[PDB]
Amino acid sequence: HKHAIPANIADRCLINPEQYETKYKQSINDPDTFWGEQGKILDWITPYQKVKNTSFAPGNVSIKWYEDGTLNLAANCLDRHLQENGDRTAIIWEGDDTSQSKHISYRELHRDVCRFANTLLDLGIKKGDVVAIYMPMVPEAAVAMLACARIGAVHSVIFGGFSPEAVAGRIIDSSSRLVITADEGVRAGRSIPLKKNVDDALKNPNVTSVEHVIVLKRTGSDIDWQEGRDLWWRDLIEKASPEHQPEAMNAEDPLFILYTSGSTGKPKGVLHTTGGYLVYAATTFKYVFDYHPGDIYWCTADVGWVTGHSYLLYGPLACGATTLMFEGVPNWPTPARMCQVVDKHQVNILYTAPTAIRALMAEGDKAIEGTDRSSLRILGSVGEPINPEAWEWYWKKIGKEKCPVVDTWWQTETGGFMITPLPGAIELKAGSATRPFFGVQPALVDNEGHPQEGATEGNLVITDSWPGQARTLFGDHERFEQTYFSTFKNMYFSGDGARRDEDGYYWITGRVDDVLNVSGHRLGTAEIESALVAHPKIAEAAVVGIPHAIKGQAIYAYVTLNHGEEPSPELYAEVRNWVRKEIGPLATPDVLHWTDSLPKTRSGAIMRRILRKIAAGDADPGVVEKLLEEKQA
Ligand SMILES: CC(C)(COP(=O)(O)OP(=O)(O)OC[C@H]1O[C@@H](n2cnc3c(N)ncnc32)[C@H](O)[C@@H]1OP(=O)(O)O)[C@@H](O)C(=O)NCCC(=O)NCCS
Numbered sequence: 001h002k003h004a005i006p007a008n009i010a011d012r013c014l015i016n017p018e019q020y021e022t023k024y025k026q027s028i029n030d031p032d033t034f035w036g037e038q039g040k041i042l043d044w045i046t047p048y049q050k051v052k053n054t055s056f057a058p059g060n061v062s063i064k065w066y067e068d069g070t071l072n073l074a075a076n077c078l079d080r081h082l083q084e085n086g087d088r089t090a091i092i093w094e095g096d097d098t099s100q101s102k103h104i105s106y107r108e109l110h111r112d113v114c115r116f117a118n119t120l121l122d123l124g125i126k127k128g129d130v131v132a133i134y135m136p137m138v139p140e141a142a143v144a145m146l147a148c149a150r151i152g153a154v155h156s157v158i159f160g161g162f163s164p165e166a167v168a169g170r171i172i173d174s175s176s177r178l179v180i181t182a183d184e185g186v187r188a189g190r191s192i193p194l195k196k197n198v199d200d201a202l203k204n205p206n207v208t209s210v211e212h213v214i215v216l217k218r219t220g221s222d223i224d225w226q227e228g229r230d231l232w233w234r235d236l237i238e239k240a241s242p243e244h245q246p247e248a249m250n251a252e253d254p255l256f257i258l259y260t261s262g263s264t265g266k267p268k269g270v271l272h273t274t275g276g277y278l279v280y281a282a283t284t285f286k287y288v289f290d291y292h293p294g295d296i297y298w299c300t301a302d303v304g305w306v307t308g309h310s311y312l313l314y315g316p317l318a319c320g321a322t323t324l325m326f327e328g329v330p331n332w333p334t335p336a337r338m339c340q341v342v343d344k345h346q347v348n349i350l351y352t353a354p355t356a357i358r359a360l361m362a363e364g365d366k367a368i369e370g371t372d373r374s375s376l377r378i379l380g381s382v383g384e385p386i387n388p389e390a391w392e393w394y395w396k397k398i399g400k401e402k403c404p405v406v407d408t409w410w411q412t413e414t415g416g417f418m419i420t421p422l423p424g425a426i427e428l429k430a431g432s433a434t435r436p437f438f439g440v441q442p443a444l445v446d447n448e449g450h451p452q453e454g455a456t457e458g459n460l461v462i463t464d465s466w467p468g469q470a471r472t473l474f475g476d477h478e479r480f481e482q483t484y485f486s487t488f489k490n491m492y493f494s495g496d497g498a499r500r501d502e503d504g505y506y507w508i509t510g511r512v513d514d515v516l517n518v519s520g521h522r523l524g525t526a527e528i529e530s531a532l533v534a535h536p537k538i539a540e541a542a543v544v545g546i547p548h549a550i551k552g553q554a555i556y557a558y559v560t561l562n563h564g565e566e567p568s569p570e571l572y573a574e575v576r577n578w579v580r581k582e583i584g585p586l587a588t589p590d591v592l593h594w595t596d597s598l599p600k601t602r603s604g605a606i607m608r609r610i611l612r613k614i615a616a617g618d619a620d621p622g623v624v625e626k627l628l629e630e631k632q633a
């Protein structure tokens with residue numbers, strides 16, 4: 001049944017159950033008053049007058065918030081805190097090696113961001129230019145992002161785990177002018193060859209836009225160097241002035257791109273602007289994590305993903321929080337690592353992923369052995385569904401039965417939390433995201449777009465805009481309309497399925513499109529198919545997800561070879577390595593199913609549902625039996 005709000009939370013919560021109901025209803029009935037007042041969570045250089053100005057209508061998808069106002073994201077995350085809180089830790093950095101760590105005051109963070117901003121400008125970088133950031137979990141990644149935002153440059157963070165080919169792709173689509181990386185990343189006592197990956201990516205003859213590469217000496221390893229192109233981070237920043245006066249950006253000036261896998265084609269750059277995004281990130285962070293000054297906060301998400309943008313850096317810093325940046329993996333060297341970090345830094349709010357929770361739970365009490373955990377007050381979960389027994393293990397083992405768990409459902413296209421508990425306001429059901437946040441109107445529709453009311457299930461749509469909504473796909477607004485606003489007209493389609501129970505709670509069941517969730521990573525099946533088919537021995541491929549006790553879904557690839565070609569264990573490894581090279585280790589098929597029996601319709605279209613069910617272990621009609629025999633082997 002429900003978990004009641006505990007008294008300690010009741011005594012402190014910013015939002016109680018009555019306040020939730022009042023605010024939500026105003027957020028929907030009168031969003032201009034509600035967000036007009038709520039926008040004051042930030043400092044504006046010139047105040048807005050218009051608040052909500054959005055349309056989801058066919059041929060007129062247009063989203064604007066606070067449009068006539070100006071601000072600077074770097075000033076809201078840094079400058080404004082300096083006067084009263086400049087000595088406060090903005091970022092606690094915990095190294096993969098626990099003997100290495102740092103506390104970085106707001107004043108120290110501000111200074112390096114000013115220096116790096118001048119560094120960028122001196123390099124000929126201007127407002128509107130795209131800057132690729134391919135960084136490990138080090139504070140210099142945050143410096144780079146915040147300095148881009150300060151000067152109105154549009155950063156494009158590329159997750160460090162992508163391959164040279166995945167990196168080149170992103171640089172080409174975005175016309176990145178600059179690449180910011182490190183000699184090597186460090187993760188689980190191991191090096192990641194980031195700069196060398198950059199070298200390989202930049203040899204792709206279709207990469208034409210890049211003028212420099214800035215390189216942080218993280219490990220001091222021997223690397224190759226291209227004179228003139230390659231610049232050391234330290235060389236540049238030490239010669240830069242610490243004085244930088246921030247200019248006003250418009251609320252709708254582009255802030256960042258994030259490449260996101262979709263149901264069809266290669267990943268596209270989900271674009272966020274400035275005002276609405278930052279208002280929404282700060283508002284959701286504060287209310288949902290019940291942030292009180294002095295609260296130590298740790299989100300485990302990588303900087304390379306939206307969770308890392310909104311809830312490691314932007315939400316927290318705007319709010320004047322201490323946010324923890326962990327360099328490593330929550331279970332290395334031992335499964336107790338995560339909770340040792342909590343004890344070490346007296347962390348009060350912990351926000352992580354179900355895959356991580358499941359990985360720790362497999363280790364049982366080894367995940368908590370020798371650790372206290374008493375500083376914790378709030379837990380959270382993001383990225384994927386969480387089953388009740390993982391939710392209960394997390395709530396009992398990590399939170400000592402004392403901490404509410406906020407299961408936050410949202411996406412890269414939403415900027416911030418969409419459906420989530422608030423810890424002082426909403427009683428928890430293990431596995432449920434619960435109720436919509438302020439300004440969020442979910443609905444469920446069937447495949448024909450018919451709204452489904454009460455306790456039912458359907459396709460999860462949002463029926464109006466909210467301040468943190470992505471504004472477009474980089475260079476392709478028509479695709480943006482087509483992808484999200486064309487299936488169910490006048491509505492934003494999330495691509496997820498959900499049920500709503502008799503209490504009005506949402507239970508997110510997962511993607512209903514051809515998108516996979518693998519270790520809490522969003523990947524398209526079509527893009528893995530392309531990677532595979534690009535192999536010179538492969539003619540066809542069909543990728544499906546299957547359940548996996550830790551990963552959530554594993555990648556199961558049915559593969560048809562060019563005629564005359566034979567399978568082998570050599571070829572098996574080689575085809576996995578092939579995808580590892582095309583995209584990255586994150587997209588590596590778990591299973592390869594060699595077949596000549598791909599099930600096609602009368603018009604040659606792949607019957608995915610049957611592949612899915614067969615892989616899950618349970619025209620030319622004969623193919624099913626051959627597929628089942630093969631699967632059995
Ligand atoms: C559970 C988890 C901690 C396990 O991590 P893991 O032990 O490294 O295993 P993963 O499946 O994640 O990674 C697979 C590979 O990618 C590599 N990798 C992972 N993150 C990397 C990074 N940041 N940079 C470079 N390589 C990375 C690993 O080293 C591994 O490589 P290998 O096969 O050569 O050994 C991790 O998958 C995780 O935190 N996922 C949740 C995602 C999330 O945070 N959700 C919300 C984000 S929006």
Ligand SMILES: CCCOP(=O)(O)OC[C@H]1O[C@@H](n2cnc3c(N)ncnc32)[C@H](O)[C@@H]1O
Binds near residue numbers: 307408494511
């Ligand atoms: C939120 C950070 C992840 O952003 P991405 O844009 O990479 O992925 C969004 C998708 O992750 C799943 N998802 C995310 N959170 C949840 C969640 N809390 N419960 C169930 N599924 C979730 C949903 O399917 C969603 O469409």
